[PDB]
Coordinates of N, CA and C and ligand atoms in Angstrom, one line a residue:
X1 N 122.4 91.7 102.9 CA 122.3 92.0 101.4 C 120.9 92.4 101.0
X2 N 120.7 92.8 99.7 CA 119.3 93.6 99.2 C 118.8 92.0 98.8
X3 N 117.4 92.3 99.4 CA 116.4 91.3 99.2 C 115.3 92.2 98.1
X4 N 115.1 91.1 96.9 CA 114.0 91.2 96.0 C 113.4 90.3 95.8
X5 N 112.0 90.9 95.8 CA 110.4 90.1 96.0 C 109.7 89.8 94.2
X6 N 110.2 88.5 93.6 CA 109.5 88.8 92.3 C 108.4 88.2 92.3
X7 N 107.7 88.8 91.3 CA 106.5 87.7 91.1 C 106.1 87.4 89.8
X8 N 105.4 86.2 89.5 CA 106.0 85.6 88.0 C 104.1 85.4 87.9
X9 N 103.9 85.9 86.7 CA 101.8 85.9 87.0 C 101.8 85.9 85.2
X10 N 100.3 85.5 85.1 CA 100.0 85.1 83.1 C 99.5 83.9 83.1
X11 N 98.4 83.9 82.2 CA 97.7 83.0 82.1 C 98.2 81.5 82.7
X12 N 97.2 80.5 82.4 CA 97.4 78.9 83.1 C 98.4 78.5 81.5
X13 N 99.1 78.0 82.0 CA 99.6 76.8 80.5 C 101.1 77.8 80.3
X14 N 101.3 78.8 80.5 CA 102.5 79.5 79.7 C 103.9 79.6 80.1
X15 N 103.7 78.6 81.6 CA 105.4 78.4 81.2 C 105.7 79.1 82.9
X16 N 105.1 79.9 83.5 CA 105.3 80.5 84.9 C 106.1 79.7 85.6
X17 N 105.9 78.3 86.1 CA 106.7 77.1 86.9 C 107.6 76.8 86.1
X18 N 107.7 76.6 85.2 CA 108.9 76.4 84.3 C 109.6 76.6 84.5
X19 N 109.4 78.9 84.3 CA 110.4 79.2 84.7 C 111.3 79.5 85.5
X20 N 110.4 79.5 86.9 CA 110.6 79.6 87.9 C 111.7 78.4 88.2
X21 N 111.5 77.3 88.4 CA 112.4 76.3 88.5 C 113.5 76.2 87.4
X22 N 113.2 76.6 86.4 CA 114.4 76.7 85.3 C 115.8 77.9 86.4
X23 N 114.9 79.1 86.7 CA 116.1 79.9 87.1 C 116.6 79.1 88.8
X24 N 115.5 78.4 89.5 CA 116.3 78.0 90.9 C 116.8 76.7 90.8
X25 N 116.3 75.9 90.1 CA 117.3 73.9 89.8 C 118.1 74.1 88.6
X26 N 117.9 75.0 87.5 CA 118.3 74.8 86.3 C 117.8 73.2 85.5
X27 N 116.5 73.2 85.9 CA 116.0 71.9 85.1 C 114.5 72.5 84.5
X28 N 114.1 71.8 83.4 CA 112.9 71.5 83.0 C 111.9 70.6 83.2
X29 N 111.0 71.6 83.8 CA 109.9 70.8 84.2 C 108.9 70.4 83.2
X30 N 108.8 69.5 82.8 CA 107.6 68.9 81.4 C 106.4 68.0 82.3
X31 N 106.0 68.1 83.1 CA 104.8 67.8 83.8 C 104.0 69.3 83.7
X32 N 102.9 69.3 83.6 CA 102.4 70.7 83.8 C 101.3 70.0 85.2
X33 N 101.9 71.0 86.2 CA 101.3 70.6 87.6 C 101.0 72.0 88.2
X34 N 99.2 72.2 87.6 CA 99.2 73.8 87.6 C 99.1 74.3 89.2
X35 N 99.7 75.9 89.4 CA 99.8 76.0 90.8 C 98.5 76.9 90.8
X36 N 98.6 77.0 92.9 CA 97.9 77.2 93.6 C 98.5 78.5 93.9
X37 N 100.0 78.4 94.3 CA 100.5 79.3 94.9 C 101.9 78.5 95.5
X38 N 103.2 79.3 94.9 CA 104.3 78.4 95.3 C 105.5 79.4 95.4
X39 N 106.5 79.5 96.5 CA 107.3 80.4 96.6 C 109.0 79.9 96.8
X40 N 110.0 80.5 96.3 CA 111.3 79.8 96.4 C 112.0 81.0 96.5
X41 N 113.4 81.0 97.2 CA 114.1 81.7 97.7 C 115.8 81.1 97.3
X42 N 116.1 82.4 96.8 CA 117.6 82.3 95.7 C 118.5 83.0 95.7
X43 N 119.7 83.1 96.5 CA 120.4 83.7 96.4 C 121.8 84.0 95.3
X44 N 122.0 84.9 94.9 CA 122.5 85.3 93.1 C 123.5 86.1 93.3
X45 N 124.3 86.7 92.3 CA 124.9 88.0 92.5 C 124.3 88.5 91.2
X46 N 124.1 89.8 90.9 CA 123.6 90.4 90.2 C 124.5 91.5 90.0
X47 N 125.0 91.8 89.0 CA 126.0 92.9 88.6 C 127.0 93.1 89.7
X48 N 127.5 91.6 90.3 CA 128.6 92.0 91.2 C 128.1 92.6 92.4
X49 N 126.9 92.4 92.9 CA 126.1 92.8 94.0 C 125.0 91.4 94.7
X50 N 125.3 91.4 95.8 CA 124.8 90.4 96.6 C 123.5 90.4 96.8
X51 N 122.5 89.7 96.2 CA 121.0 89.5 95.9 C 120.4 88.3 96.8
X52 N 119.5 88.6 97.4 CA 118.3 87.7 97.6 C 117.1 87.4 96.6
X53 N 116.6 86.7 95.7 CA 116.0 86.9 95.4 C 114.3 85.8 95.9
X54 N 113.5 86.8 96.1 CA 112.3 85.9 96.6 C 111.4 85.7 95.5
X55 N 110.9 84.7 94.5 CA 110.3 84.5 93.6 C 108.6 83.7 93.9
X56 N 107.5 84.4 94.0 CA 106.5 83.4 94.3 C 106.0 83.5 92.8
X57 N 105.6 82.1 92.7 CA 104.8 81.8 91.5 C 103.2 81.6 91.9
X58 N 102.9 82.1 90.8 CA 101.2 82.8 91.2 C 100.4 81.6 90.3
X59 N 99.2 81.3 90.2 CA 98.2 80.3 89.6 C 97.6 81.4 88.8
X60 N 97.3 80.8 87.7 CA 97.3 81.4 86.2 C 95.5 81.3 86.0
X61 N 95.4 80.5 86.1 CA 93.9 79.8 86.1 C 93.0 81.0 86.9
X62 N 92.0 81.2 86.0 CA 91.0 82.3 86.8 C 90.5 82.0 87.9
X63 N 89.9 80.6 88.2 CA 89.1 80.3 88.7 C 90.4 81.1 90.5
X64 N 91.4 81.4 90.2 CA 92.2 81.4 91.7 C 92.9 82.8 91.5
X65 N 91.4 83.9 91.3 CA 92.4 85.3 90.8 C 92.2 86.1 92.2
X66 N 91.8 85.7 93.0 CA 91.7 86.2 94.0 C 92.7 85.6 95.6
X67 N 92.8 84.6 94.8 CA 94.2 84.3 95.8 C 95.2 84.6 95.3
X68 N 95.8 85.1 94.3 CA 96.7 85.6 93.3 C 96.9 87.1 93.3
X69 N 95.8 87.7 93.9 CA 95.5 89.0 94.3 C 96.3 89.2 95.6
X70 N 95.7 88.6 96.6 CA 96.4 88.3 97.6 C 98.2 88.0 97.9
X71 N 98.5 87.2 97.4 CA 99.6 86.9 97.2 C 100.4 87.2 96.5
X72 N 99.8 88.6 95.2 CA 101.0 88.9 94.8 C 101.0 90.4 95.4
X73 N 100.2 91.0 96.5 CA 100.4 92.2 97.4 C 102.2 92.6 97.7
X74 N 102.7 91.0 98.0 CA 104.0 91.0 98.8 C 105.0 91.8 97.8
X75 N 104.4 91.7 96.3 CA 105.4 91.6 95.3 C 106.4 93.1 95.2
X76 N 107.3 93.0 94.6 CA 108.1 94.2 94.4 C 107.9 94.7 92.6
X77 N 108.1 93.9 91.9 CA 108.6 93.5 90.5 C 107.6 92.0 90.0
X78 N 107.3 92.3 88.7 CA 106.7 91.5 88.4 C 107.4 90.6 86.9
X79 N 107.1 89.8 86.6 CA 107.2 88.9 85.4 C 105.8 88.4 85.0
X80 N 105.3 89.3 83.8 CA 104.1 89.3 83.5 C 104.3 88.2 81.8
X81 N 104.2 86.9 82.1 CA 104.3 86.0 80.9 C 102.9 85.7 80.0
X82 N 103.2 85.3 79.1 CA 102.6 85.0 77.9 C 103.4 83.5 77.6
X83 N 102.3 83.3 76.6 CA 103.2 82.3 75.5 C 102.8 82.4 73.9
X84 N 104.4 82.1 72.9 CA 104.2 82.4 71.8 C 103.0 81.8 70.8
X85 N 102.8 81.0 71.5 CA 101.8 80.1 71.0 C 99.9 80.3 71.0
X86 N 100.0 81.8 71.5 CA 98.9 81.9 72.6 C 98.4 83.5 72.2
X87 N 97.5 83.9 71.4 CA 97.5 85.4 71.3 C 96.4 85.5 72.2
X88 N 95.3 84.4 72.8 CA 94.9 84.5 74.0 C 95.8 84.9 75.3
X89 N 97.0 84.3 75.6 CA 97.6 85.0 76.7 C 98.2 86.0 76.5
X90 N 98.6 86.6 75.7 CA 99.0 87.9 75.1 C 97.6 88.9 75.9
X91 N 96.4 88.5 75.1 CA 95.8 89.5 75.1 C 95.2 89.6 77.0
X92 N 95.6 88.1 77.3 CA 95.5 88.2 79.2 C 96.5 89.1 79.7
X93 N 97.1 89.4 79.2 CA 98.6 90.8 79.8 C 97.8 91.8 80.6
X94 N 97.0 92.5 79.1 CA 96.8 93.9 79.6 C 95.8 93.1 80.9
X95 N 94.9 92.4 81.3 CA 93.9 92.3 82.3 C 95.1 92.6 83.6
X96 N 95.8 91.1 83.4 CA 97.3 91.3 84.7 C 97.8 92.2 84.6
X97 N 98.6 93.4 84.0 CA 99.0 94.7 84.3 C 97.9 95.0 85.3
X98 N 96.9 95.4 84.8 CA 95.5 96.2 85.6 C 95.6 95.6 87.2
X99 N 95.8 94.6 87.4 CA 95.4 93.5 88.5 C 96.9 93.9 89.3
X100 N 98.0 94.3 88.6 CA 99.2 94.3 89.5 C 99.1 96.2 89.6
X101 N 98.5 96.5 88.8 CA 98.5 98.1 89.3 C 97.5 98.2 90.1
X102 N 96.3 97.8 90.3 CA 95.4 97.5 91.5 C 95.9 97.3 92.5
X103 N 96.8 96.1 92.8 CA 96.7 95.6 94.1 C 97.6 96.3 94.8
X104 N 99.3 97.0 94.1 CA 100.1 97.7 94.7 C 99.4 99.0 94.5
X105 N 98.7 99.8 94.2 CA 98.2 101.0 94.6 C 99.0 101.6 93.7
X106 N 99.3 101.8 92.9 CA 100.6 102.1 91.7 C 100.4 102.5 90.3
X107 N 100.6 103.5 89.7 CA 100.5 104.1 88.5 C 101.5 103.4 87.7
X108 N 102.6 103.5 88.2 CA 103.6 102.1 87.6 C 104.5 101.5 88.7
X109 N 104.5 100.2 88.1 CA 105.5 99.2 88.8 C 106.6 98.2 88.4
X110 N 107.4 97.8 89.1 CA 109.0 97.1 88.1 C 107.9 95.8 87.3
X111 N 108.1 96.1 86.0 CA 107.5 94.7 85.9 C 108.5 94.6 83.8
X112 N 108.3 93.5 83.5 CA 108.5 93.0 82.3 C 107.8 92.1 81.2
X113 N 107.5 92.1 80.4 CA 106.5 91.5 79.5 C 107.9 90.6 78.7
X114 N 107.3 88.1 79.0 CA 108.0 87.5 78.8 C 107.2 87.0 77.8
X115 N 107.3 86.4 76.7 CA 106.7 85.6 75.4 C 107.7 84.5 75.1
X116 N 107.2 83.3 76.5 CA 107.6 82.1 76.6 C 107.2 81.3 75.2
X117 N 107.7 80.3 75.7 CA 107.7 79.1 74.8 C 108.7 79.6 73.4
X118 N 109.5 80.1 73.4 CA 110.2 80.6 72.5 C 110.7 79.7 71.4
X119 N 110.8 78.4 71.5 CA 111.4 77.2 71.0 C 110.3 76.6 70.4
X120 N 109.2 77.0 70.3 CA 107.7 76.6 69.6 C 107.6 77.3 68.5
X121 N 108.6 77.3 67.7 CA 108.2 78.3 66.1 C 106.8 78.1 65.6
X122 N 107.3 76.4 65.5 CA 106.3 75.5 64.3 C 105.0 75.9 65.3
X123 N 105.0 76.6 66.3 CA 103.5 76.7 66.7 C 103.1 78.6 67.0
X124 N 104.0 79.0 66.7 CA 103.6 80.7 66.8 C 102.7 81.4 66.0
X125 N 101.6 82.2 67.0 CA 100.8 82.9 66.4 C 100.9 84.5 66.9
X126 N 102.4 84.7 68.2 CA 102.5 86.0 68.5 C 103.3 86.8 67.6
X127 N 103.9 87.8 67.1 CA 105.4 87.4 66.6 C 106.2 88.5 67.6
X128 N 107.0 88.3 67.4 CA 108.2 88.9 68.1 C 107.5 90.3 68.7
X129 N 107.7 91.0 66.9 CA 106.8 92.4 66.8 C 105.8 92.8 67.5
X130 N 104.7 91.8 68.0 CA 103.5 92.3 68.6 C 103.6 91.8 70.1
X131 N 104.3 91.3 70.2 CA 105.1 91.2 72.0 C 105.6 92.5 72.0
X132 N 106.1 93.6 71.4 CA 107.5 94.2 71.6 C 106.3 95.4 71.7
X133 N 105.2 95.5 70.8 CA 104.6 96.4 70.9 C 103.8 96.3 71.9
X134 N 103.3 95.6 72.8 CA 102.1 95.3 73.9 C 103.4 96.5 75.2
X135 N 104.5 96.0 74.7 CA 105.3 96.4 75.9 C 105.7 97.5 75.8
X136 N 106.1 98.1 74.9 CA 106.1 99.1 73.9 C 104.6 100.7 74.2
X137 N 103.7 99.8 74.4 CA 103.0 100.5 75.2 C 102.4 101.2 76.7
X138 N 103.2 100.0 77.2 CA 103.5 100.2 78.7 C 104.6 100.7 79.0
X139 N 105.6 100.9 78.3 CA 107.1 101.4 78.7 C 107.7 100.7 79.4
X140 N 107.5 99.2 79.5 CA 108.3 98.1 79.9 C 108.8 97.7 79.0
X141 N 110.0 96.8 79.8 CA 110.9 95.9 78.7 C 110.0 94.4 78.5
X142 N 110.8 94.4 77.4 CA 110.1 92.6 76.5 C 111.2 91.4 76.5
X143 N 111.3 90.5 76.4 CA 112.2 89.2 76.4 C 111.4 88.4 75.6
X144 N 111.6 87.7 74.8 CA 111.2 86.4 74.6 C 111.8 85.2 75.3
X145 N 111.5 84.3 75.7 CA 112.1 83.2 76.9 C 111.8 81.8 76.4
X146 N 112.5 80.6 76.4 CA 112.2 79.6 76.4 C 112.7 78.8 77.9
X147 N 111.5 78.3 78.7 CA 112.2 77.3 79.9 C 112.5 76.4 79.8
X148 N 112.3 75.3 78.2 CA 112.7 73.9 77.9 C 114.0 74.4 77.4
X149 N 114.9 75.0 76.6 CA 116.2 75.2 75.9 C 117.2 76.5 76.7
X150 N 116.0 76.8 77.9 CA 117.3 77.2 78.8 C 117.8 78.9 78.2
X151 N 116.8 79.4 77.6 CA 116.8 80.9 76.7 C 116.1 82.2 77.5
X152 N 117.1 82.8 78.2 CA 116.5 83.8 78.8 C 116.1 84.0 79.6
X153 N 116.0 83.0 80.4 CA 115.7 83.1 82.2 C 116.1 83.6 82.7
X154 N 117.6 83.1 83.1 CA 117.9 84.6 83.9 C 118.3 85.9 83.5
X155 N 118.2 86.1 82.3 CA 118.6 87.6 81.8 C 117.0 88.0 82.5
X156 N 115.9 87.2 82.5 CA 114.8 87.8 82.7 C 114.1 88.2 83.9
X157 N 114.6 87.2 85.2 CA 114.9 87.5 86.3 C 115.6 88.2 86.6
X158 N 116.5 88.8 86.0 CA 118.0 89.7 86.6 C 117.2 90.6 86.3
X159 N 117.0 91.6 85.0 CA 116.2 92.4 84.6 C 115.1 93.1 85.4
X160 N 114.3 91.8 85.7 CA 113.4 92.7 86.5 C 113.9 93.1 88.0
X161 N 115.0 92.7 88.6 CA 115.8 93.3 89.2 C 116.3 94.6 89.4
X162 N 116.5 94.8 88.0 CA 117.4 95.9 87.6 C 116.2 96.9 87.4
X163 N 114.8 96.3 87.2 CA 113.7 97.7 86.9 C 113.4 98.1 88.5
X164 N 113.3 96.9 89.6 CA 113.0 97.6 91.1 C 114.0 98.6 91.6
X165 N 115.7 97.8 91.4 CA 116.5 99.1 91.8 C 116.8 100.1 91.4
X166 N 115.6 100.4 90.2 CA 115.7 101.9 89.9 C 114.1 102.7 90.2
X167 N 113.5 102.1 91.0 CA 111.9 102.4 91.3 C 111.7 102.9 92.6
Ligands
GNP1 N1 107.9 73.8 74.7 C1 107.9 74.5 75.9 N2 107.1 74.1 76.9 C2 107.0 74.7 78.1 C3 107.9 75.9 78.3 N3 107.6 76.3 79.5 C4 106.7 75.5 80.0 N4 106.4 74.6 79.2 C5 105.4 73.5 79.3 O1 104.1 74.0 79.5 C6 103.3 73.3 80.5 C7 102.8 74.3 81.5 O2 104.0 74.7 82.2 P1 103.8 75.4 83.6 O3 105.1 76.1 84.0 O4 103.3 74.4 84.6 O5 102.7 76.5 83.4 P2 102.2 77.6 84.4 O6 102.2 78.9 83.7 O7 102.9 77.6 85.8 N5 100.6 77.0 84.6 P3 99.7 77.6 86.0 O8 99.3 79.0 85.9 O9 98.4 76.7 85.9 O10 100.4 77.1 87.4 C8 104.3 72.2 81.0 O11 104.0 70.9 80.4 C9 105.6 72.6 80.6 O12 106.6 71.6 80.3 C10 108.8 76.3 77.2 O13 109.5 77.3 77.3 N6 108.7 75.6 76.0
MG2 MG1 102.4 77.2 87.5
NA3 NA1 99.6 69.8 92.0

């Protein structure tokens, strides 16, 4: 069956483990236990087609942008997150675009722009509209996602799916 390599990268705090384990246990993780580097393997059907999916979750934290470099070399497709809460991680996008077109040698690549924490109204400073336009500029797709209410995960994992098997 077709194996895909995702990789889930964006600032420290926004939700990357979350959602990673949201789409392979279907649980919420409310510990924030930031990573180093962590990888899980999933098999799905995707449009009635037999999927592997390989998901490594990358460390958000600067101080580990060089192991994150490394490790997301493997990647096919990316999940480039934010959170709504956060016009600092927003504005960390464009640096991680730059860093995923660097390491694959690539003018463009499968990737998607997510604006986690979706279930955080009472705390938004993105709005929908300026997620839509960051992406909007890249000619990627956008999602907004929540990993605590279970909103968009895997439409968001599938998706970026759907951007490699057309790349
Ligand atoms: N309200 C809410 N909280 C979330 C959501 N997603 C993650 N969180 C919370 O945010 C914290 C950080 O989550 P986590 O996935 O560890 O962040 P990360 O992006 O992997 N951090 P790192 O880059 O350091 O590994 C956790 O307490 C977690 O419960 C969400 O969709 N909504
Ligand atoms: Mg993490
Ligand atoms: Na830990």
């Amino acid at each position: 069956m077709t194996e895909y390599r995702l990789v889930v990268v964006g600032t420290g705090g926004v939700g990357k483990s979350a959602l990673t384990i949201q789409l392979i246990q279907q649980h919420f993780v409310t510990e924030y236990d930031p990573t180093i580097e962590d990888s899980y393997r999933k098999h799905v059907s995707i449009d009635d087609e037999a999927c592997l999916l390989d998901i490594l979750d990358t460390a958000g934290q600067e101080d580990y942008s060089a192991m994150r470099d490394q490790y997301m070399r493997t990647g096919e497709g990316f999940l480039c997150v934010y959170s709504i809460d956060s016009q600092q991680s927003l504005d960390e996008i464009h640096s991680f675009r730059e860093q995923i077109l660097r390491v694959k040698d690539q003018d463009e690549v499968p990737m998607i722009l997510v604006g986690n924490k979706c279930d955080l109204e009472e705390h938004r400073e993105v709005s929908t509209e300026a997620g839509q336009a960051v992406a909007k500029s890249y000619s990627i797709p956008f999602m907004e996602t929540s990993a605590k209410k279970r909103i968009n995960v895997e439409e968001a994992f599938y998706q970026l799916v759907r951007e490699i098997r057309k790349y």
